[PDB]
Amino acid sequence: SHPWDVSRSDIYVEDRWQPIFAEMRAKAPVNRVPDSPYGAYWNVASHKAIMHVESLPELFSSSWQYGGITIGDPPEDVDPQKLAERQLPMFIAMDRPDHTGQRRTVAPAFTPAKMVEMEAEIRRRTASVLDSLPWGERFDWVDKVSIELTTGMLAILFGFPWRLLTFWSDWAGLTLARELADTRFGFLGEMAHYFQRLWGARMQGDLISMMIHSEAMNHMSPQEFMGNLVLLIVGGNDTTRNTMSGIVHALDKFPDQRELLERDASLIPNAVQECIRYVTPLAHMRRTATADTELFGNQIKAGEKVILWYISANRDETVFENPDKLMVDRPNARRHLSFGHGIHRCVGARLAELQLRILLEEMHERRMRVRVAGEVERVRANFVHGFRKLEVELE
Numbered sequence: 001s002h003p004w005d006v007s008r009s010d011i012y013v014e015d016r017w018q019p020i021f022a023e024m025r026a027k028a029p030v031n032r033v034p035d036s037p038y039g040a041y042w043n044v045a046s047h048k049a050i051m052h053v054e055s056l057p058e059l060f061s062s063s064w065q066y067g068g069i070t071i072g073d074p075p076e077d078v079d080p081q082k083l084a085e086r087q088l089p090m091f092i093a094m095d096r097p098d099h100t101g102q103r104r105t106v107a108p109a110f111t112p113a114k115m116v117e118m119e120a121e122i123r124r125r126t127a128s129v130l131d132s133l134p135w136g137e138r139f140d141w142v143d144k145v146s147i148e149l150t151t152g153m154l155a156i157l158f159g160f161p162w163r164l165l166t167f168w169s170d171w172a173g174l175t176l177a178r179e180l181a182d183t184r185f186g187f188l189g190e191m192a193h194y195f196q197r198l199w200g201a202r203m204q205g206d207l208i209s210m211m212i213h214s215e216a217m218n219h220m221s222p223q224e225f226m227g228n229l230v231l232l233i234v235g236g237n238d239t240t241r242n243t244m245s246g247i248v249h250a251l252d253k254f255p256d257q258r259e260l261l262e263r264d265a266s267l268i269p270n271a272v273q274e275c276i277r278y279v280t281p282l283a284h285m286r287r288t289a290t291a292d293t294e295l296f297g298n299q300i301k302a303g304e305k306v307i308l309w310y311i312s313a314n315r316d317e318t319v320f321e322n323p324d325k326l327m328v329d330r331p332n333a334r335r336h337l338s339f340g341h342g343i344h345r346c347v348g349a350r351l352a353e354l355q356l357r358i359l360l361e362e363m364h365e366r367r368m369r370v371r372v373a374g375e376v377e378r379v380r381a382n383f384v385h386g387f388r389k390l391e392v393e394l395e
C-alpha cells in the first residue's frame with residue numbers, strides 16, 4: 001500500500017494529506033502499510049481507535065526498548081555498544097510503572113495553581129516581545145515571535161541562563177540520513193555537558209530542582225539523562241512554536257474567523273483549542289504491539305508498529321462537523337487529540353494553553369492583525385508539523 005504510505009514528508013510540506021486520511025477514515029481506519037523507509041506499520045486513523053489504543057499501554061507499548069514513540073526505529077546495521085549509545089530512554093517512551101514515577105516528578109510545575117503563579121511573568125514577556133515588533137514591515141514571525149516566546153518559556157522552567165537552546169531541539173526532534181547521525185550525537189553531547197554543569201550547580205522550583213529531588217530521576221544513566229533532557233526540551237519547545245506559527249497562518253487563511261475573534265475575544269480560550277486541533281503540531285505518535293490482538297477487525301501481530309495519526313483524528317467527522325474549516329467558536333474543540341490521550345497525555349497542555357491564550361490576548365489589546373506576506377516554509381517531516389519560516393506584516 002504505497003498509496004496509504006503517509007510517512008512521506010511531501011504531503012505535509014505540500015499540505016495535501018487531507019484527501020488521503022479521509023479515504024482511510026472512510027474505507028479502513030486501521031490498515032497495514034507493508035513497506036516504507038520505516039518498514040511495515042499500521043495506520044491508526046480514526047478518533048476512537050487512537051483513544052482506544054492509547055488507553056491500553058501494557059498492550060500497545062511506548063517503551064524505547066521496542067523502539068520509542070516515533071515512526072522511526074534505531075539501526076540499519078550500525079556499530080555495537082561502542083556506538084549503540086545513540087538510542088535515548090525517556091518517560092514518554094517508558095511503560096508503567098517506570099513512567100508513572102517519572103511523570104509525577106515534573107507534573108507539579110504544571111498544576112493550575114502554578115499557572116496562576118506563572119501567568120504574570122509570561123504576560124510581561126509576551127507584551128515586551130510583541131511590543132518590539134515593527135508595524136508595516138515584513139519579518140519572520142517564527143523567528144521574531146514564536147521561537148522567542150517558547151524558548152523564553154522553556155528557559156524560565158529550567159532556570160536556564162537567559163533563540164539559544166532551540167539549536168539542540170531542532171537537532172533532537174533526519175533519522176533517514178545515515179551521514180548526519182554522528183554530528184547529531186555531537187550536539188546532544190554539548191547540551192548533556194552543559195546540563196550536567198547546571199545539575200551540579202543546582203545540586204547544592206525549576207525542573208532540575210524537581211528532578212534533583214526525585215529518586216526517580218536523581219540517578220539517571222548517561223543515556224536516560226540525555227533522553228529525559230531531550231523530552232522536556234523538545235516537549236516544551238517545538239510544539240508551542242508551531243502552534244504559534246499555525247495560529248496566525250490559520251487565521252490569515254480563515255479571516256471570517258479572525259474578524260469574529262476581533263469582534264468577540266471572550267472566544268480566545270476556545271480559539272486556542274481550535275488552532276491546536278487544526279494545526280496538530282505533532283501529527284502522530286507511535287506504539288508497538290506487545291502481543292497478537294484484534295484492533296478494529298484487524299489482526300495486529302506482536303511487535304508491529306502502530307502509528308497513531310492525530311492529524312487524521314483531528315478531522316474525524318464522527319466528532320468534528322465540517323472538520324477542515326477553522327471554527328474558532330466550535331463547541332467541542334476541546335476533544336481534539338493534539339496532546340494525545342490517556343496516561344501519557346501531554347503533561348504540558350495547560351502551560352501551552354497559557355502561553356497561547358496570553359499571546360492571543362495582548363495581541364488583541366494592540367488590535368494586531370497579522371497578514372502572511374513573504375515566504376512560508378512548513379517543516380519537512382511526518383512527525384513535527386508546522387513552520388520553519390513564516391514572513392508577515394501587521395494591521
Ligand code: HEM
Pocket residue numbers: 054091092093103106231232235236237239240243276281282285338339340341342343344345346347348349351352
Ligand atoms: C501545543 C503544545 C503541545 C502539544 C501539541 C504537545 C503534544 C504532546 C503529545 C502528542 C504528547 C504525547 C502524548 C501521548 O503520546 O499520549 C506529549 C507528551 C508530553 N509533552 Fe507535550 N505537547 C505540548 C506542549 C508541551 C509543553 C509546553 C511541555 C512541557 C513544558 C510538554 C511536555 C510534554 C511531556 C513531558 C510529555 C511526556 C508526558 C508523558 O508521557 O507523561 N508538552 N505532548
